[PDB]
């Protein structure tokens, strides 16, 4: 009852759909910003 | 036992949201709050799907 990449992750898989057809690199964005490898380190 | 539709909310507002580059600063607030799926990230399947 806390962690998460479950619930949320299932019900917007089906809604990405359009993430699909609304901008490549407008994830990419975002993504480069946070660090592929650095969200790595997230552990403990 | 499963998660509650608060995290999902959140996490479906990006992938829901706009084509606005302003929406994707939403994403950075889910993850910020949701470590354990920055993992996921990594992969961006969502990116590599367009």
């Given at each position: 009852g806390s962690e998460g990449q479950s619930d949320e992750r299932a019900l917007l898989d089906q809604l990405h759909t359009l993430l699909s057809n609304t901008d490549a690199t407008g994830l990419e964005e975002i993504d480069r910003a946070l660090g592929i490898p650095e969200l790595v380190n997230q552990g403990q | 036992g499963s998660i509650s539709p608060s995290a999902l909310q959140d996490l479906l507002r990006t992938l829901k949201?706009?084509?606005?580059?302003?929406?994707?600063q939403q994403v950075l607030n889910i993850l910020k709050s949701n470590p354990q799926l920055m993992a996921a990230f990594i992969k961006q399947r969502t990116a590599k799907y367009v």
């Amino acid at each position: 009852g806390s962690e998460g990449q479950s619930d949320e992750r299932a019900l917007l898989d089906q809604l990405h759909t359009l993430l699909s057809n609304t901008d490549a690199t407008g994830l990419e964005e975002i993504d480069r910003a946070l660090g592929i490898p650095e969200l790595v380190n997230q552990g403990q | 036992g499963s998660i509650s539709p608060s995290a999902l909310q959140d996490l479906l507002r990006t992938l829901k949201s706009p084509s606005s580059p302003q929406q994707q600063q939403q994403v950075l607030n889910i993850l910020k709050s949701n470590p354990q799926l920055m993992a996921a990230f990594i992969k961006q399947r969502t990116a590599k799907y367009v």
